[PDB]
Amino acid sequence: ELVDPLTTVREQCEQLEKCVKARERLELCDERVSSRSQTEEDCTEELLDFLHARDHCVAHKLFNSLK
Amino acid sequence: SDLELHPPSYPWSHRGLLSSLDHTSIRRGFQVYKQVCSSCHSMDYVAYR
Amino acid sequence: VAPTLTARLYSLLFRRTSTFALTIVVGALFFERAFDQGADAIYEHINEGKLWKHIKHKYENK
Amino acid sequence: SHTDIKVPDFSDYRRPEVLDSTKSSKESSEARKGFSYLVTATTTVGVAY
Amino acid sequence: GRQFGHLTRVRHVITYSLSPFEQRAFPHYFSKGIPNVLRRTRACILRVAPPFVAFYLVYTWGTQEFEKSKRKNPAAYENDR
Amino acid sequence: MTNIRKSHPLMKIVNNAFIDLPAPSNISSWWNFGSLLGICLILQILTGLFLAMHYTSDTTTAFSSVTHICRDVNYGWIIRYMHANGASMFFICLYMHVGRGLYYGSYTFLETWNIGVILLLTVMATAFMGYVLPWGQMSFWGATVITNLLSAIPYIGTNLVEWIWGGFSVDKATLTRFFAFHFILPFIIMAIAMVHLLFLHETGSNNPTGISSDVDKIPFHPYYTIKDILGALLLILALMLLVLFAPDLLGDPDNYTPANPLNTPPHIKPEWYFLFAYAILRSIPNKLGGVLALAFSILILALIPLLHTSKQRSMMFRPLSQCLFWALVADLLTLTWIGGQPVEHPYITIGQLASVLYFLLILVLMPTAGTIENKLLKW
Amino acid sequence: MTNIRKSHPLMKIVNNAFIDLPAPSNISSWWNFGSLLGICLILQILTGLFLAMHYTSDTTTAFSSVTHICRDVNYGWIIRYMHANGASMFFICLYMHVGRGLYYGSYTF
Amino acid sequence: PEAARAANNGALPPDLSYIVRARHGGEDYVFSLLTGYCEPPTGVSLREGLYFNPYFPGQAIGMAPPIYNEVLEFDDGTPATMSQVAKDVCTFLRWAAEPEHDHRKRMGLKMLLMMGLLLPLVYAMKRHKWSVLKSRKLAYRPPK
Amino acid sequence: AVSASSRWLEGIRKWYYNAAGFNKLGLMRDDTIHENDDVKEAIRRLPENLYNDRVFRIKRALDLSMRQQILPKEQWTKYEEDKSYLEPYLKEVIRERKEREEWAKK
Ligand code: HEC
Numbered sequence A: 001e002l003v004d005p006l007t008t009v010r011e012q013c014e015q016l017e018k019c020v021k022a023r024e025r026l027e028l029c030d031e032r033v034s035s036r037s038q039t040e041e042d043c044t045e046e047l048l049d050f051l052h053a054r055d056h057c058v059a060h061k062l063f064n065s066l067k
Numbered sequence B: 001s002d003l004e005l006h007p008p009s010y011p012w013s014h015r016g017l018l019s020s021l022d023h024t025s026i027r028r029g030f031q032v033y034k035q036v037c038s039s040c041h042s043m044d045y046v047a048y049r
Numbered sequence C: 001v002a003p004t005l006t007a008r009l010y011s012l013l014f015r016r017t018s019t020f021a022l023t024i025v026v027g028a029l030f031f032e033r034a035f036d037q038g039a040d041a042i043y044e045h046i047n048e049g050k051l052w053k054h055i056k057h058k059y060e061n062k
Numbered sequence D: 001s002h003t004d005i006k007v008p009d010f011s012d013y014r015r016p017e018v019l020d021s022t023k024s025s026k027e028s029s030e031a032r033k034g035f036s037y038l039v040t041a042t043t044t045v046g047v048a049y
Numbered sequence E: 001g002r003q004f005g006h007l008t009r010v011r012h013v014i015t016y017s018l019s020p021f022e023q024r025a026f027p028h029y030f031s032k033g034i035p036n037v038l039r040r041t042r043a044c045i046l047r048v049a050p051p052f053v054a055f056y057l058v059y060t061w062g063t064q065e066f067e068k069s070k071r072k073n074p075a076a077y078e079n080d081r
Numbered sequence F: 001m002t003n004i005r006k007s008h009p010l011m012k013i014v015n016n017a018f019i020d021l022p023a024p025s026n027i028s029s030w031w032n033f034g035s036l037l038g039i040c041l042i043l044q045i046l047t048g049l050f051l052a053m054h055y056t057s058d059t060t061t062a063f064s065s066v067t068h069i070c071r072d073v074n075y076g077w078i079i080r081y082m083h084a085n086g087a088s089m090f091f092i093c094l095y096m097h098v099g100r101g102l103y104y105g106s107y108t109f110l111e112t113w114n115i116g117v118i119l120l121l122t123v124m125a126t127a128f129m130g131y132v133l134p135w136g137q138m139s140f141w142g143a144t145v146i147t148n149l150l151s152a153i154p155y156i157g158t159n160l161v162e163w164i165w166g167g168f169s170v171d172k173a174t175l176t177r178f179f180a181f182h183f184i185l186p187f188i189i190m191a192i193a194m195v196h197l198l199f200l201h202e203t204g205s206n207n208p209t210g211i212s213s214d215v216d217k218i219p220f221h222p223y224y225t226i227k228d229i230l231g232a233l234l235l236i237l238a239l240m241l242l243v244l245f246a247p248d249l250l251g252d253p254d255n256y257t258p259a260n261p262l263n264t265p266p267h268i269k270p271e272w273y274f275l276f277a278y279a280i281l282r283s284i285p286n287k288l289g290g291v292l293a294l295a296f297s298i299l300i301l302a303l304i305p306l307l308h309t310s311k312q313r314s315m316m317f318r319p320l321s322q323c324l325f326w327a328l329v330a331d332l333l334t335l336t337w338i339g340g341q342p343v344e345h346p347y348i349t350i351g352q353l354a355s356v357l358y359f360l361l362i363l364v365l366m367p368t369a370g371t372i373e374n375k376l377l378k379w
Numbered sequence G: 001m002t003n004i005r006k007s008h009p010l011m012k013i014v015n016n017a018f019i020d021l022p023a024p025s026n027i028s029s030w031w032n033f034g035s036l037l038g039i040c041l042i043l044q045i046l047t048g049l050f051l052a053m054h055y056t057s058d059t060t061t062a063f064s065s066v067t068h069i070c071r072d073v074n075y076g077w078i079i080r081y082m083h084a085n086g087a088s089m090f091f092i093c094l095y096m097h098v099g100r101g102l103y104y105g106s107y108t109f
Numbered sequence H: 001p002e003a004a005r006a007a008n009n010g011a012l013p014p015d016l017s018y019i020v021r022a023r024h025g026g027e028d029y030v031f032s033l034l035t036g037y038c039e040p041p042t043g044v045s046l047r048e049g050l051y052f053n054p055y056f057p058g059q060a061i062g063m064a065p066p067i068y069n070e071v072l073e074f075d076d077g078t079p080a081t082m083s084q085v086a087k088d089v090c091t092f093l094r095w096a097a098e099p100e101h102d103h104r105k106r107m108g109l110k111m112l113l114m115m116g117l118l119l120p121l122v123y124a125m126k127r128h129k130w131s132v133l134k135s136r137k138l139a140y141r142p143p144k
Numbered sequence I: 001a002v003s004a005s006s007r008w009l010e011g012i013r014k015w016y017y018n019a020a021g022f023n024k025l026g027l028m029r030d031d032t033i034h035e036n037d038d039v040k041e042a043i044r045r046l047p048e049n050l051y052n053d054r055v056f057r058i059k060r061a062l063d064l065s066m067r068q069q070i071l072p073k074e075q076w077t078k079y080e081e082d083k084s085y086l087e088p089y090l091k092e093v094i095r096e097r098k099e100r101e102e103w104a105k106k
């Protein structure tokens, strides 16, 4: 069990604006890719820009929440 | 040209000027090495000192 | 009136350049003995339970 | 002629222990210098350690 | 030859000074000083600042123009075709 | 000179080249970098020595040994950090010591300037070679690039390089050399220094206004000796504060990995103070022509005295001649950061632009600036 | 001293500590060991150098490396032999340079 | 190195001794790296051993993720957590790369307390000596 | 090709003179000049009353630059008053060397 402190802190930050906001583009990119995946395209670029804005929030919270 | 994300700066018990390390946690930190990293990644440069 | 602490001091010590030299040596002598001792506590008081000095008490002599 | 010379006032720069015109410098003199050296000898303590 | 004797010829120039003891190590350091810093900070600042200012702009502008190019691939050519 | 102890050994009359050397009255702190070079030089050689006693020059050994210092030797970690960072705090002085040179027009002294030029040109060589010695990754490839670059010479190039390498590549005997050089060579700098200082004693120092100071002189012992000490003190912090709290900040190269000739690091640069020179090079597409610029980069400092174009020495009185000069500062500062960047098209164009500007300021504008102002003041 | 090239760089007037340094007339060959020390000293440092470039200081390496000089390095055998024997020819000078010292009573300086 | 590489399927495990100061970004690089393992985005492929992780430069790593919740038990007995476990390592390496760490900052403090004295004191003397120059007065009294 | 800008020059030159500090220390235009061989001979020929008053301005100049301070702007030099005293001597020495330098051509 123990659930980790991590995952818990993960969801609160992704509940912020820019997280979900950029996350939209993921679906937008992917769903397009879902049709167009045959093309060279990938959403990895977008996945990244998601991750950055996410972790900046994640930065402060959990390291405190640790032992 | 892979986008390199940067690690967001976490607080660190030693981050401050006069801040020190926590030895208590280190004991654990070593225990992990002997458990896991023993497989492949080595450390040549340290003795049992 | 009595001479101010300096007015004494100057006549007794800093006049003769020998004493004026000697006083310096003993000065740094005691200085480092007290000075260094204080600096540790200040630092040590900052980190509590982060050093074996405190931590080692859990396991030392079993 | 030459005797027209007269010395400007430096009062601003002095320190008031000697400020008075009617006093013997020799009263303050002892301590007056006693401070300056205290600066010097103090300094050498630091270099020494 | 010897340095101090023959340096140059000067005439009728009078000098006055005090012992370093009589006078003080700080003749109104803060009061008389802090204005003096200002009036002599501005005389140069007209001549100094502008070029550095130009640099910082270029630096910022440079990064942005750099960023758009690389980071966003589907920018000029989007993923359609 | 009755029973003056300054005659009796003669050598002390040679030591009145300091104490009574007359000096101007008004001297800005900017003239303290006279001394602070020397002390940054001495503090090397010692701290430069006690590294040698535990260092070993071998392809197999060397890197292991530098490990061995930081770990096992009592007080072994401070020294290595004083030495390396004692290099950077050496240049940051050195440049200023040139800067004062131009902006007050001290270069008017014609010989002392030149010996100045060489004395620079040597250091840049030393502080290079040593940087190979750790034999880390950034040392290995950073060695090949600089040397192999020299092959540009039309005929003798191919041989001349292979000569220094003592082989086809940078393996052992190329290392052992660069130890024995980096060891001896500072002593020669110390040799020249006592020449470079000599001619100066004839004409005395210049002074900020750019006026013959003859009527106003001061003994050197009671006054400036303190001020240098005070100057000598502020260094220590600026050295200590860096070397003690934040070791690796200015230690910008991140690469301790033992050199593998097969792998290559993605980005490769010298340490910071070199960059701008290395930035000049990337500009020129043509290889051979490219190298000359880099060689011609510094040497122009020797030609500056021919360009004294005006009737007054200082730049403190010439607003124009002052106006441009600062643009040159940012221009260099630009080059620094430029070379420290990858070679994509937003950067590429820029360096090519800043390159021409650099010379254009020194080689055209500034010599013209003095002409107008002569005409202005009705000279 | 009109257009005498000995002034113009000052450093050359320091170099009239040699050329016009007046000397006695009668001087025995025994005073040649003034120079021959110097030249035996210079000839070291150079020949002392080009050994360094191939030498290595290690308990494991060092001896192997000196082997490596006499065998594999072009003209490598002369240098090591100039250096070592360049030491003995240094002392044999040096002692004489003291001997002249006593027997003429130069120590009065 | 060969027997190392062979089992690693052509990959080469790096030495961990100073690896903190080796890679850019400091220790935070490692922690969030071991932290981050994502799902491959739509439209990207990988080699079998290679796993997609954003921080790693090529974003394909032959390291199989070591950590899951409670891989171990601690000598202490604190619950073993992917987050708790990870950080505890990322402190250790930081000590191996500079074992002098905790020792040096003593001087870092202790030199400052030292240095507070001198700079004013020295600056006290400087003005003392020069105080004769800055007190000058001139007057030009020609028989003219 | 300068007419109004010429009338703008004296706004700069006659006014430029205001933008170069040596007006503000008590110096003049002449005492500034970078010394050269001619000036070395140009100096010699100055009678006393000029010469000393060339010294004292300097001696007062330098001292001020030590204390980083600047004269009361009432007592600053006034561009309308510009003492050229150097020129009438200096053109001689430049002239008279031209002759030798040329006469020794051939
Ligand atoms: C499955 C065997 C194995 C385990 C167990 C293992 N490693 Fe890894 N790890 C590897 C290999 C092999 C690489 C390098 C593969 C590559 O670079 O593509 C790697 C990558 C790494 C890297 C980054 C290497 C680089 O190229 O930058 C680090 C740091 C690291 N491991 C540390 C650890 C730590 C900490 C642990 C304990 C949690 C650990 N390893 C346990 C096999 C292992």
Ligand code: HEM
Pocket: F041, F044, F045, F046, F048, F049, F050, F051, F052, F055, F066, F080, F083, F084, F087, F090, F126, F127, F128, F130, F131, F132, F133, F134, F182, F183, F186
């Ligand atoms: C102007 C004088 C000197 C300069 C600019 C200088 C510069 C350097 C530099 C930049 C390095 C590499 C720094 C590093 O690797 O961390 C270095 C290393 C070294 N220097 Fe010098 N040094 C000087 C004098 C000396 C002297 C006099 C000696 C020997 C007495 C010396 C011996 C060494 C050694 C053995 C190394 C290798 C040790 C090491 O790099 O960790 N250096 N020096």
Ligand code: HEM
Pocket: F031, F033, F034, F035, F037, F038, F097, F098, F101, F106, F107, F109, F112, F113, F115, F116, F117, F119, F120, F193, F196, F197, F200, F204, F205, F206, F207, F301
């Ligand atoms: C290790 C290198 C150097 C050392 C040790 C050194 C040392 C000195 C010292 C001690 C002085 C006397 C103090 C002073 O005049 O500021 C001096 C003067 C001077 N040096 Fe150097 N210097 C070095 C490099 C240079 C370089 C690289 C140049 C020019 C390229 C240079 C040009 C000058 C000049 C022009 C002066 C006299 C300036 C003046 O008197 O106003 N020096 N140098």
Ligand code: HEM
Pocket: G041, G044, G045, G046, G048, G049, G050, G051, G052, G055, G066, G080, G083, G084, G087, G090
């Ligand atoms: C007065 C000057 C010198 C004297 C008296 C001197 C003397 C010696 C002697 C007696 C040996 C051992 C001879 C042998 O092992 O065959 C030796 C070896 C050596 N010397 Fe010197 N030497 C001098 C200068 C130098 C200099 C200036 C260097 C370096 C630039 C140098 C580098 C070496 C080296 C590396 C060795 C070991 C090589 C070898 O011994 O085979 N020596 N020297």
Ligand code: FES
Pocket: none
């Ligand atoms: S020489 Fe190979 S990249 Fe410039």
